[PDB]
Symmetry: C3
């Protein structure tokens, strides 16, 4: 099916945690960028208007671009970069299927690492595997690493001597992430995307992690474990059978990724909450938490195929 | 079977190498903590008494905690932290089988990374696989990374700007590690545990590394190679057929992990010594080494199931 | 067959990119060291003459050294280091087959990390697998990370505090690497060698990466993806079917590995060029590039088995 989407690139303020804000060059003014959810084989057109003062592109990471290399989105290799004020059109077939993503390919050490120029590109297989068909809830987790010294210095950063100090899932750090809420008998798919500069070791308590897909491609047999080491650019789809009611941590097991600046108990961390046990526990950090749906695109993935903006991810224009 | 153990948490001084000491919050005053060696399906009870001045927990990494989530050991999620002077009891079934471990889950960027709050939990399968039955000697290697600027500053550390400078197997750096002593025909199992903040690349000379288990679970077929990339929280069991008499290095292949402070020839490094070739070689660093048995818990793993303390790992009370 | 090679170790100046030179201890005055290309089972002799003022060895990484441990090349373990002015002879069988390499084993934090003391050791199998027989072009990419502050301070470096700032394929950074030139129907084998201190995440646009070998050993089935996480010491052979004409980036997806000093658009990066689409494009960085053959040993690997020096990699004597 033919599908046509429009994206703008806007100077945008976001807040990672507390008072830690950041200047971003955000697609449709949100970080992560809009979800693009299409069927394997769809013919996609994207029109990208640059409303910032710096050049950009969009590269579609995981798209083979068969016969369409001039839409690969690499400045000085497949196109002239999109200059401020200009519009560029990308045209490609959505293939192969799987957890893909898209990001700017200009000055990546700054733009992708710390300017939020990334979003998920989910391509549905025409014929999903049996394991895919057991999934009841589908989550996207984009992992990023930020250097706060460059928070309000657009056009700069991503250089030797940088001190990484904030770590996010979908551009929020714990305790401002959202819980993953389930019931016994659910099967969840965690689509982990290595959007950052660091390796992350994603560990889930109380459950068997079934690493079932790498870079969109199904593994011969899922690998069982409890910690998934994921590097920059990689994607892993982890399937978890929700057979064990409780309150359960999901976090980066690299301990320096669980801090917010110099404070512990932050960074890349959330929880799985089963409705069977409830959250009314005197010790529980999130007993009084106001839940925000769609923080992992888990509701938007249930909508009709297309591009989905998010009020959850929208920042403030600069 | 029902098994009941006691642990204290004590302020403890350990020495990594030479004159490099560290302040630790040690389980039973030792680092690594006591070996817990039990059968799959055993009902384990652990009474934990906090004799330090900071709060702690024990998380049982790899234990599914089926129906026992309140024993998962996460402060502000599954319990209130164990306050100084108090005793908390963990109750869980030992499952699944494999190389597991335990560690504090309070302020992990400090407590786990640099206060030695970790030990091995070995759960024997009721029906071991054929490859496991070939094993003649079993070794536990826990890999850690230390920041010496915080050595004597308990309650501080694990923050942006930290400079890692010491690297250990079971809390010692080379040359104060111990040789792995074998004879031709032996089959050894190295249980590698990523207790640290960094990825380690464990390389063994003269032999084929058979990567046979990840996070306790058997891989469909062992992966053959010579270098095992292991990240924080992961465990890998590597089986080696001892068919090649000589003196053989095993070391982290990340070169910055083989230094003691700014001196070369240290960190995560030991040798494999075959009795056939002997150690009487003029060039050999360890020709006159005082051998310490049980440095990899290789002697304790042969004893009756239960908890094993060791004077080898015991520090000095602070 | 019996094969005998000579290597000198010489103080040598190389240039990574632009004006960024480095003092190296180079085998035959080149970095990477000469290609050794032999058949599985060949009996190799290497006479190594030290013409520098520091001690060195050569370790043959991936060589089992069955019965030949005293040729393993580890100082203080299998030999006395080779002193200045001295000659040491290594004798071993070339086994097993695969992408192996060789490097000094003295003060590796300096000598291997930043003194260029490494080269490829390709051992051809007697009976290649069906996937190996589909390969039309064979490339060697040795990945390194450098600390420029020690560039001209031989005998120093590789210590806590170091700031890594240059990243290379075969001792050159983009834009001074060379394009990989193919035609439709080609099948290329990228032999990736983790010669550096860092993990690298090698990402190829427009093609499916088939990760087919680890540490020289064939994987049960190739793993499909687009990004290969490769750690220090590891080797991965990636097979790519060239079925998609275009100009395509290959680069390290850790974004801080794509900078030269504090400048973007450098580091571990090159392109694949299909002859069908040409290079005459106004936006293309390398439209006017002077192509230098054998930058990936792609020509030398086609020559008769033996040792191959390279003018491309030759530095200047110091
Ligand atoms: Cu951009
Ligand atoms: Cu603690
Ligand atoms: Cu050397």
């Amino acid at each position: 099916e033919k599908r046509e989407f429009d994206l703008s690139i806007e100077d945008t303020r976001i807040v990672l945690v507390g008072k830690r804000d950041f200047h971003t060059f955000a697609f449709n003014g949100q970080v992560p960028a809009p979800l693009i959810h299409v069927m394997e084989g769809d013919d996609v057109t994207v029109n990208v208007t640059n409303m910032t003062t710096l050049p950009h592109t969009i590269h579609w990471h995981g798209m083979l671009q068969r016969g369409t290399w001039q839409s690969d989105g690499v400045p000085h290799a497949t196109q002239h970069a999109i200059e401020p004020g200009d519009t560029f059109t990308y045209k490609f077939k959505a293939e192969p299927a799987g957890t893909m993503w898209y990001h700017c390919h200009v000055n990546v050490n700054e733009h992708v690492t710390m300017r939020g120029m990334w979003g998920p590109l989910i391509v549905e297989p025409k014929n999903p595997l049996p394991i895919e068909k057991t999934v009841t809830k589908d989550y996207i987790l984009m992992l990023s690493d930020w250097v706060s010294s460059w928070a309000n210095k657009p056009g700069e950063g991503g250089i030797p001597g940088d001190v990484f100090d904030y770590y996010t899932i979908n551009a929020k750090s714990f305790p401002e992430t959202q819980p993953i809420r389930v019931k016994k008998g659910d099967v969840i798919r965690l689509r982990l995307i290595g959007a950052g500069d660091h390796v992350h070791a994603i560990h889930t308590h109380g459950h068997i992690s079934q690493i079932a897909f790498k870079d969109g491609f199904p593994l011969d047999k899922p690998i069982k474990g409890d910690t998934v080491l994921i590097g920059p650019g990689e994607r892993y789809d982890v399937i978890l059978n929700m057979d064990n009611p409780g309150l359960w941590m999901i976090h980066d097991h690299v301990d320096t990724h669980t801090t917010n600046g110099d404070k512990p108990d932050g960074g890349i961390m959330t929880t799985i909450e089963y409705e069977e046990v409830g959250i009314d526990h005197p010790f529980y950090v999130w007993k009084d938490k106001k839940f925000v749906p769609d923080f992992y695109y888990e509701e938007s993935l249930k909508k009709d195929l297309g591009m989905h903006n998010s009020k959850v991810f929208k920042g403030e224009p600069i």
